Structure formats: C-alpha cells, structure tokens
Amino acid sequence: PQSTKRFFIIKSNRMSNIYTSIQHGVWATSKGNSRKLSNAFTSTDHVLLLFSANESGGFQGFGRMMSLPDPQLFPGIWGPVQLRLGSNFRVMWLKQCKIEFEELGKVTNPWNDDLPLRKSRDGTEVPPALGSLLCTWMSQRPSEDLLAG
Ligand SMILES: *O[C@H]1[C@@H](O)[C@H](n2cnc3c(NC)ncnc32)O[C@@H]1CO
C-alpha cells in the first residue's frame, strides 16, 4: 500500500535507548518490525514514530523515520541487544514532550483489534486520523528535556 503519512507506536524497554535515540538520531526495532517499517518507508511520504517507553504511562515524543535500516549506521550503539534487533536507521525527533495515555481518555485502536492505545505493542500502527491528532497534541505541548537525568 502507498500513502502520504503513516503512524507507528514505538516501545522501548529501557529509557537509555530513548536518550541515545535523541542524542544521535537513530533507532532500531525487532527484525519483524524492521521489515514492516522498511516497507512503509519506501511506500509512504512520511513514516511517523510515536515513542513510548515501557511502563512510562504515555508518550515521550514523536519523530520521522529518515532512512532504511543500515548495518553500517552506528553499529552496536545499543550494546548487546543490537544482536536481537534489525539494523539501525536514522530518525529525526520532531518533539520531546510528556503526554500520559490517561490524558487522552478511553481511546481504542481499530487497526489493533480494538485494544486501548495504552496497550499498544512495539510497531503497532494507528489510523491516520488518530495518529495525526496524537502528533498535533504532542507538538502543542511545551518541550520536555527528557535528557534531564
Ligand atoms: O515491547 C518491546 C519493547 O519495549 C522492546 N524494544 C523494541 N525495540 C527496542 C529498542 N530499540 C533500540 N530498545 C529497547 N527496547 C526495544 O522490545 C519489546 C519486545 O520484545
């Protein structure tokens, strides 16, 4: 499928990887999600990534996928978990913020089996009407210095 904008929820089990992503403009995901994001990148004008650390209760910001996975990009930057991930790709964070899932009220995702937004696994796609609004709301918040600490 070809389209203008697509939106994916990214989960991280460690805050340090979010900090590394922000400092270096890089991400990597599971091998299966890497194929999904790669297919989206080559078929979509803009692939937006909405970042939510595990057990953080919400989103820390969003960014645009800028390149395809590349084994030569920052090899091994995540440590040994690199072995369980696809290759690294460039991401440009467009906003760092704090928005809790609870602030959005009850929201479910029709592209993810009617699961609550807060129950999204890594790589979950959201429909464009919802994804666009999530990015708009994030952009309208004050920027948060996530690297504080
Ligand atoms: O639920 C997810 C998730 O939080 C985690 N995940 C996926 N991709 C990453 C990265 N990329 C650098 N860093 C930390 N955690 C990550 O994996 C589980 C699924 O096993």
How many Å apart are CA 102 and CA 118, to the nearest integer? Answer: 8
How many Å apart are CA 89 and CA 8, to the nearest integer? Answer: 15
How many Å apart are CA 89 and CA 26, to the nearest integer? Answer: 6
How far is the CA of 90 from the CAs of 28, 29, 46, 49, 74, in angstroms? 9, 12, 13, 11, 10
Closest ligand 1 atom to the C-alpha of 78? 12
Number of domains in the chain: 1
Q: Indicate if ligand 1 lies below 6 Å from the C-beta of 8.
A: no
Q: Report CA(81)–ligand 1 centroid distance (Å).
A: 9
Method: X-ray
What is the structure's resolution, reported in angstroms to one decimal? Answer: 1.4
**What is the extent of the structural domain holding 3?**
1-149
Q: How many CA atoms lie within 13 A of 92 on its CB side?
A: 6
Q: Tokens 């996530």 correspond to what residue?
A: 146
Among protein residues, the one with the nearest Cα to ligand 1's atom 4 is 12
Instruction: Tell me which residue of 111, 98, 106 sits closest to 57, measured CA to CA.
Output: 98
